[model samples]
Target: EFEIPDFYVPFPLECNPHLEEASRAMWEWIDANGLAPTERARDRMRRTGADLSGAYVWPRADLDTLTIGLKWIALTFRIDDQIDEDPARMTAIDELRGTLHGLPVSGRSPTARALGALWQETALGRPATWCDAFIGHFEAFLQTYTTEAGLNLRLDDYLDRRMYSVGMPWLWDLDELRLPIFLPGSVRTCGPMNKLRRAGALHIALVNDVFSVEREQHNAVTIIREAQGCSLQEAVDQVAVLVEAQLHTVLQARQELLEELDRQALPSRAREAAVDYAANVAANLSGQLVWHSSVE
Candidate 1:
């Protein structure tokens, strides 16, 4: 019922060497935490290809970091699946919120337990500032689920919420874990940088809608179809246009960020970090595509 058009990805697909080790360890961690205690649950999580996607998305991260990233990807996909399959999982959502806030989890659900464990590992050695930033982004991402649960979303509202609901900002914060310098609020919130991030988010969300429409109950393609009263293929092609448009925005905003950085007085290292961050965001556009194609 869906057809994807040609995509433009300038970045090369790279895999982390630790993917094999990380997948094994990530599954072990998930099992140990009871996140996927059943064979069916484990199979579903494995089908997400979280380890491979994490490997592609952060190919340069250390094995330990890569493993954590894999586990994180797995956790988020599991939570997303939970919410999608059963909207009554709000109690688990509240526990996850508590985990991010450092509150004690009641351990009532495996999702909360897994999150509590993951949050500990995620925050253990990171600096206070990084932890704070991650907490804020992750909390914001989790809140979007509530908004998504109450759905009729016009394209504009859907696109806006879908950007956050996709968790690109949270993943970008994870990217910061591998960097030496934390992204300053000013740098992160600057106009060009914000555009780059939003474009990146929409890029991922739109492509995801195209590729996942068969399985996903709600996606941008579906919204477009209903709103435009178009065929599924037409809706899919429309999102392809939207995806390419975001790609152009990503490239342009990235270029603009470089010009902005040159004009600003930030330190040399911060400039390097900001530049690398943009590149990583662009690379993940391809990274996610490669990962999704593997699922296909």
Candidate 2:
């Protein structure tokens, strides 16, 4: 077993009040859509508490959208389990890629078929531009799997790759899917918001690496171990400090963005969107840690 360090999660741990109902709805959708077709896969899905993560990450989402968001989170975990191991996992990767690109998903694997169904439902009520942006994020995430195989990298390269591979961007997009607002293109591209994004990604990936260090081959902890020639426990401690620093950056960037917005005299609606976006990003970082550390 690995030691999980104390996390600095300043964000409130607000779970959706509709969690029970949403979890139930998610299961029904999973069953109807053949998401976990095998009994063993269903058991694995149960262990993830993915819906709980969704409940915490998107606490303000309405019931119907929350259910869909939960399924998406659960499917991401399923896909990770599928491709993080054997080399033959490429088949599953190809199938998920096909689904992302809107190609005909003819694969017979449970995940492939499930993604085919889920993606359609996810895109149903959203605008084409939103769908396109989401697909762009999803595509970047998909592109990382193949290049990540060898996993030998310096600290810089590891962090660069980890930000995309962690899949936080597309997961964050769920906020837009549930709410009526979208981040303006200019605000999204601005420095502070981008820093906030990087900080959230780093925190999630590093925390996960620490938790799974013993079992995982491709992780930042392993890279740190080789680079510093430290003991595994020592490497974990180093990453623990790094996690703290990333959380600091997350909050700092959030404050910086709001201050800049006030200086610019942006409209109240635009300011609120920026605030909402940062809060959700912080929630996602904190929520992942809570859910990961919790037992099913």
Candidate 3:
């Protein structure tokens, strides 16, 4: 049986305006387009940011504005279901990898064709550098996810790959992507801010790993079980402490990054974009925490 620990989790993301209508509308598009095959999964897709969950993320977005994120979420979940079903297979992933990189993916499967279109839609109006980075991260995730053996590795080693596999970093960039201005490549390439970026992604990955403990044989469970020879519940308990610590690390680094942002003499547009980027990221992380446990 699954167990819920006495954790201090809370839903703190305030509703901005409203996006449920937009999110639901996108659900129908995905369902009719064949991206989402099952009705049961499609039902939850409408409420992807479910109000009943008390952790709805896109609470304030218009139909056109929210569609990008809503569709992105739906697409990823469909892809995830494929991975979860066949962790040993690589055909679909390879097709997707090539499709994202400009190669044509000719297929009737809604997932395949839809992804190519999604890539086109996402890369539209974005910098080539951004698309390049996004594709690179995606390829790295597929490479490691399909080739690496997790059972033999320690927690850190496992996470080195799992972080990419989880693909939160690529998705987190959406916070910045949807904005008008972007940080100089210097901030993204190599710096303390990069470390902060990474830590934030890793924290999200760890939280998801913890929440999925009951569903899959996650690396965190393996790390704890191999180290302590404990039951599944015990493994989850120990990982909880690890995530709580990682949470502090993420928050500390966020403050540091914000202070650095405060020091920058950016133009009005750039500064506004930067502030929005940071806020979107904060919302995404908070929403992730609530979603992992509450997503239906």
Candidate 4:
């Protein structure tokens, strides 16, 4: 069921302790700082807000990569589970055959091309090294998928299809800052995975909020307009408070889970998976500082 070769290291060993401590530190720092009207506080609030929002748009390629990779992982796990139940390798193959046969054939090519265009648009005109590794990963995925499915596709054709749909020259819309090379390579290596983790955590928090249903009815601009009675700094501080509370809740949940697993003597694989998830979440919280500190 693990379609990924056994040779692949799924998570980093060095990150385990830092992940635990960082989670605690981030929550404490946010609480002690007091979300308020100070210029520095306001800067942090605005930057965090913008980055959280802009993140929905930024690194669009990385998002696609993570989505596809995670989907493959999930599917592989399901297949593995079924194989474990039956204790037969052929059962897994039959399951995959059924799934593959049911997959929509016509959509794959266009979807692949669209993803390629998104990747190109996000990384365009930057020093290639900034995203070369990510791009290489995407290329390998695309090539393997296409070959497995017997789809004949030139890389240029895929690029052209993406460009046509986007309707703008890649160079014109892309700017230097959009490439986001400022993130450290260490951060970049884990960046997309962590972003995915934080986004899931954030979504859960927002959904749990008492007012989230009502709040979702309004756009960001509308929400800002309503908060105009408060000074911009006050509005930012309010958001910071909410964000900090959410971070604290998530960290506490992580701590309790880790403790329970240890006390119960869970399998090493289970513990490792939990640690991997926590590391991504911690990395994401720390990575926000890269953008938050840049706001003037």
- Best of the candidates, TM-score: 1
lDDT of 3 by residue, 1-296 (tens): 64755445332564434455655666576766777677766665545543322223443344464566667667777777666664445677778788887887676666877878888988887887777777777677667755663342567777677778777666655545545666656445535466666666676677777666666644676678878887878877777787677667666766776677667665767656655555555565666655555555
How close to the true structure is residue 135 of candidate 4, measured as C-alpha lDDT?
44
Model 1, 93-129: lDDT tens digits are: 7778988777886546768777887899789877777
Q: What is the lDDT of candidate 3?
A: 0.63
Off by over 4 Å in 2: 1-3, 88-92, 106-110, 150-152, 263-267
For 1-296, candidate 4 gives per-residue lDDT tens digits of 11111111122222122233333343343334332224654354444443232232222224333333222222222323333343234422433333222322333432233333334455665556545544443343333332323332332243233322221111112211322233333332343333433333442333222123233312222244364665544543454454555566555655655565465554565455445544544444443343333442
**Superposition TM-score, candidate 3 onto the true structure:** 0.81
Candidate ranking (lDDT, best to worst): 1, 2, 3, 4
Candidate-wise lDDT, in order: 0.81, 0.78, 0.63, 0.35
Candidate 3 stretches greater than 4 Å from native: 1-12, 40-62, 83-88, 106-109, 148-152, 231-234, 262-265, 292-296
Cα distance off (Å), candidate 4, residue 79:
28
Worst 10 residues of 4 by lDDT: 1-10
The per-prediction CA RMSD against the true structure, in angstroms, equals 2.1, 2.6, 3.6, 21.9
How much is 207 displaced in model 2, in angstroms?
A: 1.2
Better of 1 and 3 by lDDT: 1
lDDT tens digits, residues 191-220, model 2?
Answer: 888899899888999998887776565688
